[PDB]
Design an enzyme around this catalytic site. Sequence first.
Site, PDB file in Angstrom:
ATOM      1  CG  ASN A   8       4.202  -1.080  -1.503  1.00 57.08           C
ATOM      2  OD1 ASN A   8       4.873  -0.971  -2.551  1.00 57.08           O
ATOM      3  ND2 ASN A   8       3.363  -0.136  -1.088  1.00 57.08           N
ATOM      4  CG  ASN A  10       8.302   1.697  -5.166  1.00 57.52           C
ATOM      5  OD1 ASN A  10       7.379   2.521  -5.172  1.00 57.52           O
ATOM      6  ND2 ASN A  10       9.578   2.045  -5.304  1.00 57.52           N
ATOM      7  CD  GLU A  36       3.370   2.199  -5.356  1.00 59.10           C
ATOM      8  OE1 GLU A  36       4.310   1.821  -4.641  1.00 59.10           O
ATOM      9  OE2 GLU A  36       3.229   3.382  -5.730  1.00 59.10           O
ATOM     10  CE1 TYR A 109       0.158   1.647  -1.127  1.00 57.83           C
ATOM     11  CE2 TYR A 109      -0.880   2.052  -3.222  1.00 57.83           C
ATOM     12  CZ  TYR A 109       0.080   2.360  -2.299  1.00 57.83           C
ATOM     13  OH  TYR A 109       0.964   3.390  -2.548  1.00 57.83           O
ATOM     14  CG  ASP A 149       1.838   0.249   2.387  1.00 59.57           C
ATOM     15  OD1 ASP A 149       1.780   0.772   3.520  1.00 59.57           O
ATOM     16  OD2 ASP A 149       2.409   0.813   1.417  1.00 59.57           O
ATOM     17  CG  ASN A 151       0.548   4.079   3.382  1.00 59.94           C
ATOM     18  OD1 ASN A 151      -0.014   3.880   2.293  1.00 59.94           O
ATOM     19  ND2 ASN A 151       1.825   4.334   3.477  1.00 59.94           N
ATOM     20  CG  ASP A 246       9.424   2.259  -1.458  1.00 64.05           C
ATOM     21  OD1 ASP A 246       8.786   1.284  -1.891  1.00 64.05           O
ATOM     22  OD2 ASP A 246       8.962   3.406  -1.358  1.00 64.05           O
ATOM     23  CG  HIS A 247       7.073  -1.077   1.236  1.00 64.24           C
ATOM     24  ND1 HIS A 247       6.222  -0.848   2.304  1.00 64.24           N
ATOM     25  CD2 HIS A 247       6.857  -0.066   0.364  1.00 64.24           C
ATOM     26  CE1 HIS A 247       5.507   0.238   2.066  1.00 64.24           C
ATOM     27  NE2 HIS A 247       5.869   0.731   0.895  1.00 64.24           N
TER      28      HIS A 247
HETATM   29 MG   LIG Z   1       5.714   3.017  -3.647  1.00 63.84          MG
END
Ligand SMILES: [Mg+2]
Length: 259
Positions: A8, A10, A36, A109, A149, A151, A246-247
């Site tokens: 991911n 971002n 993303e 995602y 991802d 989540n 961030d991942h």
């Molecule tokens: Mg993100």
Amino acid sequence: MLKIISANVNGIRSAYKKGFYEYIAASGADIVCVQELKAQEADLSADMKNPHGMHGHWHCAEKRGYSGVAVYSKRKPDNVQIGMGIEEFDREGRFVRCDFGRLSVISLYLPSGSSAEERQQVKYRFLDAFYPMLEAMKNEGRDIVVCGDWNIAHQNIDLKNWKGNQKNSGFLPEEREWIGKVIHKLGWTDMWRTLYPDVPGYTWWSNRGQAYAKDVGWRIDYQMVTPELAAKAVSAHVYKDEKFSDHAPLVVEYDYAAE
Ligand SMILES: [Mg+2]
């Protein structure tokens, strides 16, 4: 080995400013599944469509700067599925499937729910629509890796603050149960947890500041794998030598080829 990376990013434009493009090549990956994009097709440069001359297939969202997934591969897929065929979710660019002979790799995602109850409801509706697809896919008898991802953190080991997150999206009882069913009822293998039973393997932290420095992480990125291919997995790692997002990228090596 066949090396598959799930990341991911971002925002692909942001990740490319942070060295992700060079990493696609340096990593030695055969297939890179990204989530993303935060970009529509018009926003993608040539190097975001066909990085290093790889074949690329993507599903972008109708909203600007939002969601989107892609699969990049050294080899040419012989079949590609863009979207799930469910308008509600496909308008958000959340699913691409690429086939290479009897191998299929997906970039997924899964909707996040922490923003608002409406989105938690979308997330639950996605889980219910996607579960029968996972069941059907498992029954194809083909070799499949569902990257992305998801989540959802499954067990206490999968996040730093399990004590304080049981009422928060990503670690709700119903969500954890759902992942557990995908693994134990449908028979998908959570590749990381199977390879390394005792190693947390966090893949997300909310920022690159305190949250990262203090390792307030969650393992919400997965490679879910069919049985025969899971038995071919030889190693995996969460790549943290550079920070693109961030991942962190989830890398798995399989003793496998499609020919
Ligand atoms: Mg993100």
